[PDB]
Amino acid sequence: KNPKSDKFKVKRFHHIEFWCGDATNVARRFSWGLGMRFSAKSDLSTGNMVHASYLLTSGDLRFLFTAPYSPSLSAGEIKPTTTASIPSFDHGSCRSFFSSHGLGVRAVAIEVEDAESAFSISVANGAIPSSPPIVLNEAVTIAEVKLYGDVVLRYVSYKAEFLPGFERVEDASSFPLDYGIRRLDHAVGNVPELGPALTYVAGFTGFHQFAEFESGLNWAVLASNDEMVLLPINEPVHGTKRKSQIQTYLEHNEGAGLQHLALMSEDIFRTLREMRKRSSIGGFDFMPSPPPTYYQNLKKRVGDVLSDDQIKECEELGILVDRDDQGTLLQIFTKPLGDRPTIFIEIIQRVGCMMYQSGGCGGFGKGNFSELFKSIEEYEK
Amino acid sequence: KNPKSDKFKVKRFHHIEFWCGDATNVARRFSWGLGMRFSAKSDLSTGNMVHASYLLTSGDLRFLFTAPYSPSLSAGEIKPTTTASIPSFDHGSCRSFFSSHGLGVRAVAIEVEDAESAFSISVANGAIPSSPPIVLNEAVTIAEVKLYGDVVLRYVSYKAEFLPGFERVEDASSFPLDYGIRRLDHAVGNVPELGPALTYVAGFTGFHQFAEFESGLNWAVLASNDEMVLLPINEPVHGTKRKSQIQTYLEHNEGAGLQHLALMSEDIFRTLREMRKRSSIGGFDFMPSPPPTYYQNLKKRVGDVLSDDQIKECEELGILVDRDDQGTLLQIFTKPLGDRPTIFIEIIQRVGCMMYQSGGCGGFGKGNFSELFKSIEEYEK
Ligand SMILES: Cc1c(C(=O)C2=C(O)CCCC2=O)ccc2c1c(=O)n(Cc1cccc3ccccc13)c(=O)n2C
Ligand SMILES: Cc1c(C(=O)C2=C(O)CCCC2=O)ccc2c1c(=O)n(Cc1cccc3ccccc13)c(=O)n2C
Ligand SMILES: [Co+2]
Ligand SMILES: [Co+2]
């Protein structure tokens, strides 16, 4: 069931912005670890005396890394005279965010038809305003409302290159890395209480609950009209023998925030071979692979979708596989991206649901919780 | 002239500690950019609820990257019950340092015979105490005094693996990168006033001025008895046409601090080939190469030390060459290591002064200031 109840016209995920203490070092690590190219910058070299912001791209995926400079560099400026390319930026907010949460996502940005309208209708429908709509060089409009914790949902709309005041990056400094990652599939938040978080976000967006099919959590997924903007939300389940990883997140993050980003690959096998080659030379680590009983159970569940060869390749790379009633999901999880056991990345590929591929084809891996437990015990043999 | 006036027995540089907002991402970038192996860690996985610290090594060079966790993880602890492996660490100090300075060096650590004695004699001779001597697991003694700005000189002494409470890193996670870097040659500070900085540091160490042989700066080098611990210090020269890079440092750093680390390579050509291969894929960038007139002037100054082939190789890699009365210096400078135009790295190799090689053989590149200007104008032809 899809009521198509969006209160304003939503297009696609546009970008994700990390707030950092040093944007250079995070951006360079991510670039090499994920195979993303340096494509735009806004910093001292472009006249920005407020913040350093570096943009990585792979396909349609856009990762933005931003850190504050000394406030003294811009102490003479006022908002009407600011050199910041992102007018919502605030030194105090950024430093407070990073000292409270460590490295993580500040903004989940979606492109909309009209960012000013999205902002007003959102706020009219319960959204807590974060930064009012501002028109940049008469070309791009940017507005922000609170999403959860200190994460904002950022509306971006274009009259008609990333943002004004960003410069394309020199081709010498811009090496065309590509491991097959192509777009953001979903972005997932952890909160202490799922009900009120859902009521709030669905309340100001009109996003609807995405239909799906006892370990750790409860969740629900909010979706836009064409279900291409997908925002799952988790809450912890307390009292378990094994302490909820959602609760560990909340403790180490100092409250709610973004838990994982799921990046669609056009060839998850190429992506994982490439990322795994680089894990111990500056890239990203992956969670421990499932036991071979898990892959010794894959024939009976997806034997009609993947060959024996493609299954063995899943076993080599530690890939997980789930299926719903319309499609199949290949997925794998990184270890946390920084010091704290908080944010991590998921790589996914979806097969099925062809009409273009419909959003969320195969679900989000709900079945792999039960399957992982079962195969763990079967390998215990 | 070397009075050998050290007020306590100094051995060698031991390590350099960067204070970070996220230590994981800086450490992984540095590891790949410099070819340094992950060798020890102290973090949540080792029981440290206070700070995350990761150690990179290449030869005898030791780079330590440390960031604070949420204070809430250790709110129940007191100093007698701390889980920090570095007892001088303070959340408030670390966050204040990084927000004021951005990414940079907090500690220049030297190994001494007796860290408690070095501390007392230092403080008795004008050193401002930063952290008193503390004995770790009855095996290692650690003490800190102020050096300049918010940088400390850290004394480390061993009765008899890095520090207690650090764990050796798994060989899976520890890839044996090596681009030829072998030890720290010198560590250089920028201050507003050279005279008082020298009087202070030479005052509490007994370090002597290292003898050498109008662009930007004045400097002097402090040295230990065998001149293997080398601490140059710069001050800006004001009123120039070209604004002093020392003054730019002080403005963007919010005052005094460490300007560059000079890393000796056993094969600067291999090191620079390897680092330059990686500049645009997550490593380090290098300052703009000198004009070919500079290399077209190298025959007349070092033609007795480097072949024509070894000179052309200098031209390919952008290496600079200087000479004093006892030896020859090959050197090159990276662009800044992080967002701000503050700290950078120098790669060097020294040839001559064999007895072992004596410290500072060839100097620090004083002559390359005049030579660079001259060759710039000659290429202007
Ligand atoms: C993150 C995720 C998803 C996922 O994407 C996701 C959505 O998009 C929206 C719905 C809620 C949700 O969850 C699906 C399955 C997952 C994981 C995962 O993170 N984990 C890893 C793991 C969790 C705890 C403890 C662990 C201990 C060791 C190793 C892994 C651990 C899984 O096992 N499954 C099976
Ligand atoms: C950092 C250094 C040293 C050096 O090691 C050092 C010591 O150890 C102790 C003594 C003081 C000192 O200085 C020696 C020579 C150097 C540089 C250097 O940094 N630079 C780079 C540069 C400086 C300004 C403006 C620049 C603009 C563009 C490119 C480079 C620029 C040089 O040119 N020389 C020639
Ligand atoms: Co997911
Ligand atoms: Co130097």
Short mmCIF file of N, CA, C and O in Angstrom, two decimals, chain B residues 290-343:
data_model
loop_
_atom_site.label_atom_id
_atom_site.label_comp_id
_atom_site.label_asym_id
_atom_site.label_seq_id
_atom_site.Cartn_x
_atom_site.Cartn_y
_atom_site.Cartn_z
N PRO B 290 60.55 23.29 -8.11
CA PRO B 290 61.31 24.46 -8.56
C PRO B 290 61.49 24.43 -10.07
O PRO B 290 61.36 23.37 -10.69
N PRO B 291 61.78 25.57 -10.69
CA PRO B 291 61.92 25.61 -12.15
C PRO B 291 63.15 24.84 -12.60
O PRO B 291 64.10 24.65 -11.82
N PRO B 292 63.17 24.36 -13.85
CA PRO B 292 64.34 23.59 -14.31
C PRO B 292 65.65 24.35 -14.25
O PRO B 292 66.71 23.72 -14.20
N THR B 293 65.62 25.69 -14.25
CA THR B 293 66.85 26.44 -14.00
C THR B 293 67.47 26.05 -12.67
O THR B 293 68.70 26.01 -12.55
N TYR B 294 66.64 25.75 -11.67
CA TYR B 294 67.16 25.25 -10.40
C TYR B 294 67.96 23.98 -10.61
O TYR B 294 69.05 23.81 -10.03
N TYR B 295 67.45 23.06 -11.42
CA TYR B 295 68.22 21.85 -11.69
C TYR B 295 69.32 22.11 -12.71
O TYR B 295 70.35 21.43 -12.67
N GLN B 296 69.13 23.10 -13.58
CA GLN B 296 70.18 23.59 -14.45
C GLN B 296 71.24 24.39 -13.71
O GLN B 296 72.20 24.85 -14.33
N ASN B 297 71.09 24.58 -12.39
CA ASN B 297 72.13 25.17 -11.56
C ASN B 297 72.73 24.15 -10.59
O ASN B 297 73.67 24.49 -9.87
N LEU B 298 72.21 22.93 -10.57
CA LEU B 298 72.63 21.93 -9.59
C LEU B 298 74.01 21.36 -9.89
O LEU B 298 74.71 20.94 -8.97
N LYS B 299 74.40 21.33 -11.17
CA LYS B 299 75.72 20.80 -11.51
C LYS B 299 76.82 21.61 -10.82
O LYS B 299 77.72 21.04 -10.20
N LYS B 300 76.73 22.94 -10.88
CA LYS B 300 77.78 23.79 -10.35
C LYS B 300 77.85 23.78 -8.83
O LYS B 300 78.87 24.22 -8.28
N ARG B 301 76.83 23.27 -8.12
CA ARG B 301 76.87 23.29 -6.67
C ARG B 301 77.03 21.93 -6.01
O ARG B 301 77.54 21.86 -4.89
N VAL B 302 76.60 20.85 -6.66
CA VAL B 302 76.68 19.53 -6.05
C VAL B 302 77.10 18.49 -7.08
O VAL B 302 76.92 17.29 -6.87
N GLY B 303 77.67 18.95 -8.20
CA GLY B 303 78.13 18.05 -9.24
C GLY B 303 79.16 17.03 -8.79
O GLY B 303 79.36 16.02 -9.46
N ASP B 304 79.82 17.27 -7.66
CA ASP B 304 80.77 16.31 -7.11
C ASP B 304 80.11 15.29 -6.19
O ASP B 304 80.80 14.37 -5.72
N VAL B 305 78.81 15.42 -5.92
CA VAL B 305 78.11 14.57 -4.97
C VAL B 305 77.04 13.72 -5.65
O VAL B 305 76.84 12.56 -5.28
N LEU B 306 76.36 14.28 -6.64
CA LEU B 306 75.32 13.56 -7.37
C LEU B 306 75.68 13.49 -8.85
O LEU B 306 76.11 14.49 -9.44
N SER B 307 75.47 12.32 -9.43
CA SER B 307 75.65 12.15 -10.86
C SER B 307 74.62 12.98 -11.62
O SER B 307 73.66 13.50 -11.05
N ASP B 308 74.83 13.09 -12.93
CA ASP B 308 73.83 13.71 -13.79
C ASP B 308 72.51 12.95 -13.73
O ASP B 308 71.43 13.56 -13.79
N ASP B 309 72.58 11.62 -13.62
CA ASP B 309 71.36 10.82 -13.52
C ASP B 309 70.61 11.13 -12.23
O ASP B 309 69.40 11.38 -12.24
N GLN B 310 71.33 11.10 -11.10
CA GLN B 310 70.75 11.43 -9.80
C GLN B 310 70.26 12.87 -9.73
O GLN B 310 69.39 13.17 -8.90
N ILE B 311 70.81 13.76 -10.55
CA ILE B 311 70.31 15.13 -10.60
C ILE B 311 69.01 15.20 -11.39
O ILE B 311 68.04 15.85 -10.97
N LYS B 312 68.96 14.53 -12.55
CA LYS B 312 67.73 14.50 -13.33
C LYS B 312 66.59 13.89 -12.53
O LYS B 312 65.44 14.35 -12.61
N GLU B 313 66.89 12.85 -11.75
CA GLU B 313 65.90 12.25 -10.86
C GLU B 313 65.40 13.26 -9.83
O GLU B 313 64.21 13.27 -9.48
N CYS B 314 66.29 14.12 -9.32
CA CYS B 314 65.86 15.21 -8.46
C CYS B 314 64.87 16.11 -9.19
O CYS B 314 63.88 16.56 -8.61
N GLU B 315 65.13 16.38 -10.48
CA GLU B 315 64.24 17.24 -11.24
C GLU B 315 62.88 16.58 -11.45
O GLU B 315 61.85 17.26 -11.39
N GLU B 316 62.86 15.27 -11.71
CA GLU B 316 61.59 14.59 -11.91
C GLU B 316 60.72 14.71 -10.67
O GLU B 316 59.52 14.98 -10.77
N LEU B 317 61.31 14.54 -9.49
CA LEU B 317 60.56 14.45 -8.24
C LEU B 317 60.42 15.77 -7.51
O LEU B 317 59.72 15.81 -6.49
N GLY B 318 61.02 16.85 -7.99
CA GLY B 318 60.92 18.12 -7.31
C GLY B 318 61.79 18.26 -6.09
O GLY B 318 61.57 19.17 -5.29
N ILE B 319 62.79 17.40 -5.93
CA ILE B 319 63.66 17.43 -4.76
C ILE B 319 64.53 18.68 -4.77
O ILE B 319 65.01 19.12 -5.83
N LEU B 320 64.75 19.26 -3.59
CA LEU B 320 65.69 20.36 -3.40
C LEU B 320 66.99 19.83 -2.81
O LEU B 320 67.01 18.79 -2.14
N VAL B 321 68.08 20.53 -3.08
CA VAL B 321 69.41 20.12 -2.63
C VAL B 321 70.12 21.31 -2.00
O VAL B 321 70.18 22.39 -2.60
N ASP B 322 70.67 21.11 -0.81
CA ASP B 322 71.52 22.12 -0.20
C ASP B 322 72.80 21.46 0.29
O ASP B 322 72.88 20.24 0.45
N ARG B 323 73.78 22.31 0.58
CA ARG B 323 75.08 21.85 1.03
C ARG B 323 75.63 22.86 2.02
O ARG B 323 75.44 24.07 1.84
N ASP B 324 76.27 22.37 3.07
CA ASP B 324 77.05 23.21 3.96
C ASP B 324 78.53 22.82 3.82
O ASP B 324 78.94 22.32 2.76
N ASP B 325 79.32 23.03 4.87
CA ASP B 325 80.75 22.75 4.78
C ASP B 325 81.10 21.30 5.11
O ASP B 325 82.26 20.92 4.97
N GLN B 326 80.13 20.50 5.54
CA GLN B 326 80.40 19.12 5.93
C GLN B 326 79.55 18.08 5.20
O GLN B 326 79.94 16.91 5.19
N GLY B 327 78.43 18.46 4.59
CA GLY B 327 77.58 17.47 3.95
C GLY B 327 76.56 18.08 3.02
O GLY B 327 76.50 19.30 2.83
N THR B 328 75.74 17.20 2.45
CA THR B 328 74.73 17.56 1.45
C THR B 328 73.35 17.12 1.94
O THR B 328 73.22 16.06 2.58
N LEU B 329 72.34 17.93 1.66
CA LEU B 329 70.97 17.70 2.13
C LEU B 329 70.03 17.62 0.93
O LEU B 329 69.95 18.56 0.14
N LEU B 330 69.31 16.51 0.81
CA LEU B 330 68.20 16.39 -0.12
C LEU B 330 66.89 16.56 0.65
O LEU B 330 66.68 15.86 1.64
N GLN B 331 66.00 17.43 0.17
CA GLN B 331 64.79 17.76 0.92
C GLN B 331 63.63 18.09 -0.02
O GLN B 331 63.82 18.57 -1.13
N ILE B 332 62.41 17.88 0.48
CA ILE B 332 61.21 18.27 -0.23
C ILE B 332 60.10 18.43 0.80
O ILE B 332 60.13 17.80 1.86
N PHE B 333 59.13 19.28 0.49
CA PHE B 333 58.08 19.68 1.42
C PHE B 333 56.71 19.29 0.90
O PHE B 333 56.40 19.51 -0.28
N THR B 334 55.89 18.72 1.78
CA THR B 334 54.50 18.50 1.42
C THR B 334 53.70 19.79 1.56
O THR B 334 54.09 20.74 2.25
N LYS B 335 52.56 19.81 0.86
CA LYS B 335 51.51 20.74 1.20
C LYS B 335 51.02 20.45 2.62
O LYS B 335 51.27 19.36 3.16
N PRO B 336 50.28 21.38 3.23
CA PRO B 336 49.77 21.13 4.59
C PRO B 336 49.01 19.81 4.72
O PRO B 336 48.33 19.36 3.80
N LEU B 337 49.15 19.20 5.90
CA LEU B 337 48.63 17.86 6.14
C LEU B 337 47.13 17.83 6.32
O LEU B 337 46.52 16.76 6.17
N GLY B 338 46.53 18.96 6.68
CA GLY B 338 45.09 19.03 6.92
C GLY B 338 44.46 20.27 6.33
O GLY B 338 45.01 20.87 5.40
N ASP B 339 43.30 20.69 6.88
CA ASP B 339 42.55 21.80 6.30
C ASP B 339 43.34 23.11 6.33
O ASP B 339 43.23 23.92 5.41
N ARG B 340 44.10 23.34 7.39
CA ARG B 340 44.65 24.68 7.56
C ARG B 340 46.06 24.76 6.99
O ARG B 340 46.79 23.76 6.99
N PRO B 341 46.49 25.94 6.54
CA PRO B 341 47.88 26.11 6.06
C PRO B 341 48.84 26.23 7.23
O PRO B 341 49.42 27.29 7.51
N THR B 342 49.00 25.14 7.97
CA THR B 342 49.77 25.17 9.21
C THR B 342 50.86 24.11 9.15
O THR B 342 51.94 24.36 8.60
N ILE B 343 50.59 22.91 9.65
CA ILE B 343 51.61 21.86 9.73
C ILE B 343 51.79 21.19 8.37
O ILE B 343 50.83 20.98 7.61
#
